[PDB]
Write an enzyme that holds these catalytic residues in place. Structure first.
Site, PDB file in Angstrom:
ATOM      1  N   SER A  92      27.498  30.998  43.212  1.00  0.00           N
ATOM      2  CA  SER A  92      28.508  30.589  42.391  1.00  0.00           C
ATOM      3  C   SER A  92      28.163  28.999  42.078  1.00  0.00           C
ATOM      4  O   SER A  92      27.336  28.782  41.221  1.00  0.00           O
ATOM      5  CB  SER A  92      30.057  30.796  42.797  1.00  0.00           C
ATOM      6  N   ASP A 214      31.647  40.416  35.778  1.00  0.00           N
ATOM      7  CA  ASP A 214      31.961  39.065  36.367  1.00  0.00           C
ATOM      8  C   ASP A 214      33.201  38.133  35.798  1.00  0.00           C
ATOM      9  O   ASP A 214      32.786  38.122  34.504  1.00  0.00           O
ATOM     10  CB  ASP A 214      30.956  37.977  36.887  1.00  0.00           C
ATOM     11  N   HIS A 243      32.798  38.684  41.542  1.00  0.00           N
ATOM     12  CA  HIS A 243      32.279  37.516  41.604  1.00  0.00           C
ATOM     13  C   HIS A 243      31.394  36.946  43.086  1.00  0.00           C
ATOM     14  O   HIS A 243      30.736  35.981  43.040  1.00  0.00           O
ATOM     15  CB  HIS A 243      33.191  36.227  41.528  1.00  0.00           C
TER      16      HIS A 243
END
Length: 265
Positions: A92, A214, A243
């Site tokens: 991320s 996502d 995610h």
């Protein structure tokens, strides 16, 4: 530091690999990933400043008002550990944080593997980031209004998946374990960041791993990093919802991740 960032360097493999978590989680996001790595790589783990795993008194709001603050912590951690070269896996926001750190030290990373990374979440001309300022402002209200209530709803969407799966409940506990005003601060820092202009100056080979569905990162963002990043790149869409796929679907993700940790282009 090192004690501060909970650094842990488990593993018995010939090549060094750094695992960096994203927002709301900590190094526990790599729980299911580590056993698949320990035989082939030596794995450095740590927690970002501001995580629940972390003393809030070392969280300088001023230092982490940009993502470059995290990139320096990374380079500081890696010098404490006399590291001269490694493979960076970033989940991320940490995927971008690694690209930042490579602008400072382009030799430290022989390879960057981003999982669900995004340089900008706000939509712009010819850029689908997936969010607008209304979508952002609405989220900052609920984050301050009732943080416990906001975590309750944000967690099942982040992980994707059922409001009963272990991953959703585990992510929800580390997300709620952040000091609320630190969490609000870090959220605005990530969701309002814009790192597109520095991508052509990133010459480290970047393997872009993206989940099929996502919430925070549209799949087109991966192909934007493919074309805008300066060095060699390769995109791989993971057949996975969520995610945090290395937490919610490790069985699918790990064979893919381990293939790119061993890829030469």
């Amino acid at each position: 530091l090192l004690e501060v960032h909970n650094v842990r360097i488990v593993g018995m493999g010939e090549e060094l690999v750094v695992l960096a978590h994203g927002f709301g989680t900590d190094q526990s996001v790599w729980k299911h990933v580590i056993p698949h790595l320990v035989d082939d790589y030596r794995v450095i783990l740590f927690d970002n400043m501001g995580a629940g795993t972390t003393d809030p008194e070392y969280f300088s709001f001023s230092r982490y008002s940009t993502l470059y603050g995290y990139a320096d912590d990374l380079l500081t951690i890696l010098d404490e550990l006399e590291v001269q070269s490694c493979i960076f896996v970033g989940h991320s926001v940490s995927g971008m944080v690694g690209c930042l750190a490579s602008l400072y030290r382009p030799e430290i990373f022989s390879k960057i593997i981003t999982i669900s990374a995004s340089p900008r979440y706000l939509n712009d001309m010819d850029y689908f980031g997936g969010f607008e300022q209304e979508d952002l402002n609405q989220l900052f209200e609920a984050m301050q209004s009732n943080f416990k209530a906001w975590v309750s709803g944000f967690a099942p969407l982040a992980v994707g998946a059922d409001i009963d799966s272990m991953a959703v409940q585990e992510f929800g506990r580390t997300l709620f374990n952040i000091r609320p005003d630190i969490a609000f601060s870090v959220a605005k820092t990530i969701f309002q960041s814009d790192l597109r202009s520095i991508l052509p100056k990133v010459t480290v080979p970047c393997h872009i791993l993206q989940s099929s569905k996502d919430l925070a990162v549209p799949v087109v963002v991966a192909d934007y990093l493919h074309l805008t990043l300066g060095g060699p790149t390769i995109v791989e869409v993971l057949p996975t919802e969520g995610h945090l796929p290395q937490l919610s679907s490790p069985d699918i993700v790990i064979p893919v991740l381990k293939r790119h940790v061993a890829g030469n282009l």
